[PDB]
Structure formats: C-alpha cells, structure tokens
C-alpha cells in the first residue's frame, strides 16, 4: 500500500454533506459535471451518498443527479455518469478527526480531493498531506 489504514468511524447508511474546513464549503457536483464548493447549505447538488466497494474504498455519488465524483488523468475532479476506475477513493481518517479522500487510481501520486478557500477544487498534483484543503467533515443532510 501507498497509504495508512486509519479509518473514520462513520458509516454509509445516510447521505452526507462533505464540509471542507479550509474555506467552509460543501463539495458540489453540478448537473453539467462541474465540481466545486458552495457555502449555500440550501444547494441541491451537495447531498452525497457514499458507498464502500472494499473496506476503506468508496464511491461518492450525487443523490440529485446520480453522478459519481471522479478524478481525471490530469488531476481534475469531474462528475461521471458511470462508475469507472477514476471514481474510487481511499477514505481515511486524518489528524485524528477529519476524512480525506485519495484517488485510488492515482494513489502513488498522493492526489486528494480538496477545496481551496475560494471554493474552487484543487487539482491532484497541487494537493498533499498536511494541507487544510484536503480535510472534510461528513455532516448530515
């Protein structure tokens, strides 16, 4: 493995919001496949359903649109209509509290899901362990 195996304590029974501490945005997957963040808790595209493919490996799906979160070969997040290898993330505990999501496809590169303070997503190569951008908290919908 390229990464530790500390797992968060939550579960996949309910959908969640993924809140990023960095700028205080919720991860959003828009109908046209765009991925960004918003602080609007009333947005209909921030409700996400996580599911485990293997222990610690997840899909992250928009409940409104059905799209899967995915990271492409240049490190950009996008919404995928179908599950593919780019849609699997290694979900881990971080700093004894937060959830992080590493691209499984790009795990050797340490490419994370992350949000900037201005609510734009991070590109994979601009992410790294230690950043605030990569830290999420799952919140009830």
Swiss-Prot record:
<comment type="function">
    <text>Plays an important role in the regulation of cell survival, cell division, angiogenesis, cell differentiation and cell migration. Functions as a potent mitogen in vitro. Acts as a ligand for FGFR1 and integrins. Binds to FGFR1 in the presence of heparin leading to FGFR1 dimerization and activation via sequential autophosphorylation on tyrosine residues which act as docking sites for interacting proteins, leading to the activation of several signaling cascades. Binds to integrin ITGAV:ITGB3.</text>
</comment>
<keyword id="KW-0339">Growth factor</keyword>
<keyword id="KW-0217">Developmental protein</keyword>
<keyword id="KW-0539">Nucleus</keyword>
<dbReference type="GO" id="GO:0030335">
    <property type="term" value="P:positive regulation of cell migration"/>
</dbReference>
<dbReference type="GO" id="GO:0005104">
    <property type="term" value="F:fibroblast growth factor receptor binding"/>
</dbReference>
<dbReference type="GO" id="GO:0060681">
    <property type="term" value="P:branch elongation involved in ureteric bud branching"/>
</dbReference>
<dbReference type="GO" id="GO:0008543">
    <property type="term" value="P:fibroblast growth factor receptor signaling pathway"/>
</dbReference>
<comment type="similarity">
    <text>Belongs to the heparin-binding growth factors family.</text>
</comment>
<dbReference type="GO" id="GO:0010595">
    <property type="term" value="P:positive regulation of endothelial cell migration"/>
</dbReference>
<dbReference type="GO" id="GO:0005737">
    <property type="term" value="C:cytoplasm"/>
</dbReference>
<keyword id="KW-0497">Mitogen</keyword>
<keyword id="KW-0963">Cytoplasm</keyword>
<dbReference type="InterPro" id="IPR002209">
    <property type="entry name" value="Fibroblast_GF_fam"/>
</dbReference>
<dbReference type="GO" id="GO:0008083">
    <property type="term" value="F:growth factor activity"/>
</dbReference>
<dbReference type="GO" id="GO:1902533">
    <property type="term" value="P:positive regulation of intracellular signal transduction"/>
</dbReference>
<keyword id="KW-0007">Acetylation</keyword>
<dbReference type="GO" id="GO:0022008">
    <property type="term" value="P:neurogenesis"/>
</dbReference>
<dbReference type="GO" id="GO:0005178">
    <property type="term" value="F:integrin binding"/>
</dbReference>
<dbReference type="GO" id="GO:1903672">
    <property type="term" value="P:positive regulation of sprouting angiogenesis"/>
</dbReference>
<dbReference type="GO" id="GO:0001525">
    <property type="term" value="P:angiogenesis"/>
</dbReference>
<keyword id="KW-0221">Differentiation</keyword>
<keyword id="KW-0358">Heparin-binding</keyword>
<dbReference type="GO" id="GO:0072163">
    <property type="term" value="P:mesonephric epithelium development"/>
</dbReference>
<dbReference type="GO" id="GO:2000544">
    <property type="term" value="P:regulation of endothelial cell chemotaxis to fibroblast growth factor"/>
</dbReference>
<dbReference type="GO" id="GO:0031012">
    <property type="term" value="C:extracellular matrix"/>
</dbReference>
<feature type="binding site">
    <location>
        <position position="22"/>
    </location>
    <ligand>
        <name>heparin</name>
    </ligand>
</feature>
<dbReference type="GO" id="GO:0032148">
    <property type="term" value="P:activation of protein kinase B activity"/>
</dbReference>
<dbReference type="Pfam" id="PF00167">
    <property type="entry name" value="FGF"/>
</dbReference>
<dbReference type="InterPro" id="IPR008996">
    <property type="entry name" value="IL1/FGF"/>
</dbReference>
<dbReference type="GO" id="GO:0044548">
    <property type="term" value="F:S100 protein binding"/>
</dbReference>
<dbReference type="GO" id="GO:0070374">
    <property type="term" value="P:positive regulation of ERK1 and ERK2 cascade"/>
</dbReference>
<protein>
    <recommendedName>
        <fullName>Fibroblast growth factor 1</fullName>
    </recommendedName>
</protein>
<dbReference type="GO" id="GO:0030334">
    <property type="term" value="P:regulation of cell migration"/>
</dbReference>
<keyword id="KW-0597">Phosphoprotein</keyword>
<dbReference type="GO" id="GO:0045766">
    <property type="term" value="P:positive regulation of angiogenesis"/>
</dbReference>
<dbReference type="GO" id="GO:0034605">
    <property type="term" value="P:cellular response to heat"/>
</dbReference>
<dbReference type="GO" id="GO:0005615">
    <property type="term" value="C:extracellular space"/>
</dbReference>
<dbReference type="GO" id="GO:0050673">
    <property type="term" value="P:epithelial cell proliferation"/>
</dbReference>
<dbReference type="GO" id="GO:0045944">
    <property type="term" value="P:positive regulation of transcription by RNA polymerase II"/>
</dbReference>
<dbReference type="GO" id="GO:0045542">
    <property type="term" value="P:positive regulation of cholesterol biosynthetic process"/>
</dbReference>
<dbReference type="GO" id="GO:0005654">
    <property type="term" value="C:nucleoplasm"/>
</dbReference>
């Amino acid at each position: 493995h390229h990464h530790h195996f500390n797992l968060p304590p939550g579960n996949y029974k309910k959908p969640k919001l993924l809140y990023c501490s960095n700028g205080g945005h919720f991860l959003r997957i828009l109908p046209d496949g765009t991925v960004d963040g918003t602080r609007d808790r009333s947005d209909q595209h921030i409700q996400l359903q996580l599911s485990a493919e293997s222990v610690g490996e997840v899909y992250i799906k928009s409940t409104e649109t059905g799209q899967y979160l995915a990271m492409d070969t240049d490190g950009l997040l996008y919404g995928s209509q179908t599950p593919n290898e780019e849609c699997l993330f290694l979900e881990r505990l971080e700093e004894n509290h937060y959830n992080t999501y590493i691209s499984k496809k790009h795990a050797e590169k340490n490419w994370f899901v992350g949000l900037k303070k201005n609510g734009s997503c991070k590109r994979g190569p601009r992410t790294h362990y230690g950043q605030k951008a990569i830290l999420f908290l799952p919140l009830p919908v």
